[PDB]
Symmetry: D2
Subunit: 301 residues, 4 copies
């Protein structure tokens, strides 16, 4: 009867994701599902022990796929490691579908873009109901670094990373800005004394994953938060512009591929999609980026 979210696989991401939910109050319900029943169950005990202090307390309980019949979102947090996740994914989607599930999919495990489309196959529901991290975290990583660079609130910083999530991302420097003044127009005062520091900031973003991963072993708080953000926009029908994994079909010259761009999100899922008036470099970059992703698909299917 109320906002329910089934979350598949309680790893570091699924956990952090789950704890963000606890603290922000986005859903009323959460059920944690894992093969590692041990690691899930214990999660549902620790989390529930903060309930009496949660400003927006969630009913957190564990279960198995029989409980996702009514679930309104399933979040998925479960080299050639690809097919492994695929055996895992198809090994895991088939279970939820039989349950009675008729909601909207949400996925976060790398390689997200691949695994999103991979998820679109096994499922068989309108392409407006499968989603993935896309470049939100990278947009948010880009915002953060641009807020620290320009010294204005991140939310007052507007700049997308777009494309797939990996070795081929790109900045939309064109319509990037701070409070409605374009990034370009900001540097215009000092010829390259910004410019290249901002191009370095591009690399800090592209690299930040590896960096964090080198420092504390993995990455999880960030995606947890972006996860939570996408969720909110969905449950509470926001019509919010996020850079999720959206199925294009003509947009940015590409078709037959889940990619990260500015997609509107609401109760349904992907609602509209913004085609951005890009440019050669970025268009080419996106086009090329749209490239590698098309490849990796065919055979593994």
């Amino acid at each position: 009867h109320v906002n329910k979210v089934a979350l598949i696989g309680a790893g570091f991401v699924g956990s952090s994701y789950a704890f963000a939910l606890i603290n922000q109050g986005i859903t009323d319900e959460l059920v944690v599902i894992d093969v590692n029943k041990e690691k899930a169950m214990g999660d549902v005990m620790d989390l529930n022990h903060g309930k009496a202090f949660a400003p927006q307390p969630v009913k957190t309980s564990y279960g198995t796929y029989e409980d996702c019949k009514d679930a309104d979102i399933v979040c998925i947090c479960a080299l050639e490691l690809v097919e492994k996740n695929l055996k895992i994914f198809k090994g895991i989607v088939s279970e939820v579908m039989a349950s009675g599930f008729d909601g909207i999919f949400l996925v976060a495990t790398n390689p997200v873009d691949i695994l999103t489309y991979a998820t679109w196959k096994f499922s068989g529901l309108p392409k407006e109901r499968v989603i993935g991290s896309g470049t939100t975290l990278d947009s948010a990583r880009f915002r953060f670094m641009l807020s620290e660079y320009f010294g204005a609130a991140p939310q007052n910083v507007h700049a997308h990373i777009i494309g797939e999530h990996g070795d081929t991302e790109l900045p939309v420097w064109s319509h990037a800005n701070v409070g409605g003044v374009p990034v370009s127009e900001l540097v215009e005062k000092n010829d390259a004394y910004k410019q290249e520091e901002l191009d370095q900031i591009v690399d800090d973003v592209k690299n930040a994953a590896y960096h964090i991963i080198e420092k504390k072993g993995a990455t999880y708080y960030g995606v947890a938060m972006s996860l939570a953000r996408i969720t909110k926009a969905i449950l509470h029908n926001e019509n919010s512009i996020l850079t999720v994994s959206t199925y294009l079909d003509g947009q940015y010259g590409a078709d037959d591929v889940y990619i990260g761009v500015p997609a509107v999100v609401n109760r349904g899922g992907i609602a509209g999609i913004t085609e951005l008036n890009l440019n050669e470099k970025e268009k080419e970059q996106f086009l090329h980026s749209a490239g590698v992703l098309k490849n990796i698909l065919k055979p593994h299917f």
Copy 2:
């Protein structure tokens, strides 16, 4: 300078969840993460800070050292060893007492003039030692105490009775540990005492609630076996205390607080209901414990004496 700042010390699992909970709830305007292992701390600053753009309540999170505790409004200590499966408590205490020794000296040497918030286990004893080491008043040194254990009790009572954790009112008190006791005598669901509720079933209600108590004391053991540690509960718990503190709440929480005579106990840091606010402790909630409960509460504070003396 003019705005709420939390210094966290020790970015293991515990402190990092506590920093994340804060990142999500927005209790403080600023958070400084310090830990001798620079790698993990600055590695954690980056990861939290990247969520910023999607966080509701705005927090500047940086890396810092002890000197940055200068204008901290609060220092939260979550650092120090875990109790290895062999050793005793007195043993762990020895080892954690030399950690807290180094830490507090530096904290104080920075110029810090705030409030201490202790997570390290056993937290009662280690709150006692922050008070003595630091020089500060017993009102400005607080440990999570039995807050977690009550929120734990609160929840289990909650689901078993079908009412919100917020509407269920019962304390676990004394020790964060094995000799902890429920104040059944004052407990209730919307004001209707629990003892009157169980009427409905004998050999069906009255001892399931005993299992519930059992489930609370050894909840920390059941969690560790099932994933490794425990951090999400102590996270909320700690966060609840910062909020109550930073927002000058005059809220009532069962933290570790200095008793000098209350409850039949003194010269000990123990868990009892306290009024928490901008200064720390402001008042002590004197329960009328029944026979069974005063007796148990004495065993609990004596045992904390068992370690404080040596």
Copy 3:
């Protein structure tokens, strides 16, 4: 699909309530229905305008009865010779329409006499009694709790005390269970000095009077009720199981039945889900029979 409340009556009360959700983000959407379009529309436009700068995006709109069809909650705050006979007439129609609208959710009444109109509401509706709820004594209990909080130096969230019976001037405190942090007020008056119990009865005399006192000063009372209604609505939409002293129907419970009266009750998505029956004392038992009498002798005609 998403949380929807339909407020009927955009006076000072209905208008303040809307502002509370629009500030707390309790709901996803709200529709504002009033016998007066140029007031209700102004209200609607004044809210939505601050949407850009608000916590949770709430969508607000002007409308009429037909819009209730899918509302999870209709909240009614619409209202010399008899006040009661009038509003009875007014509810009969208001309720009449939303019944015929198809609306199959939950009624929340606020208009005074809140207990009678919740009784009447229920009468006109034919919905199960558990789905018909008045703001009961929850505004009284809250006033009582701010007051003891100012008295005992503890926070309102930690002062536990019920007002029960009719919302009005035969309302009674439940001292036998009033407590701060778990410690009874009885004990706390064993501290203090000269002046305890005497000033406590002033506090209780001030809770009967607060309405009368705010009106003397500002012609109407609206903030506190907004905050009451806003909290019941919360308990309902997010299914929290909240003990609140709403106006509710009685099964003999408390030695009186058939009436709608302010008592502690378990509120969730389904409505009322259990009456908390407290163990009253000699005094309390009788003050409560005299309240229930007066109320059930207003109904008869």
Copy 4:
């Protein structure tokens, strides 16, 4: 030690402002100040009566000037409102005499926070709270064109189909008739609104002008409908307050002193600013086109005049 806001003026705006805070938990303390002790004190009473059911319990008290000593923000909502028959300069005259006593008494109590003026016409009274008070310009802040902006964003969210947070479009100028959109930068999700009607020319590009003359007419409109406006300004005053209490470095079209910018100076007027615990941290200078240029200076021209009879 804790966040304290002083509200001077418990009218429709003041009270609504207090109710937003009491529902949003942005301040820790609020004291309401008002020579009408009955109203002021009636609001404190009704607002406290909700305290138990607040998610972020605020502390509210009735007080007076002496209680602004430790306040972080003084919010002025005290003032007369314009009678249809009287000129704006008649309104100002009346309002400036109230401000001088208000701003004089606040200062003599030991206050040293940031002023935040809402009373109309805000920019004039902002300047006068500045002059009267002799504080740094950065710490006298006016409500500016923040609501005008907020409306300008609501209407544009309903016309373009995306969340008001996704919509970016400043109104700037004086908070009144001579204000103006900044179409040159306006943009949904980053894409310029020019690029959005590029597909749908003028049939659209006159719908927007309508959206603008309604932004420019919402005041009178709501004032004709529900009898008075106030919820909107409340959410603006709350947002600004929130950015200063929590040290946001957020951008808001607030009224500010410009020292040369936009060809204007010695004048408070509404432009985008960086706002924090110090007040105005910076002044957001956007590259305006020729038209936006011309309208801005003229709007500056109106304020300057009203100011002159006390410009010395």
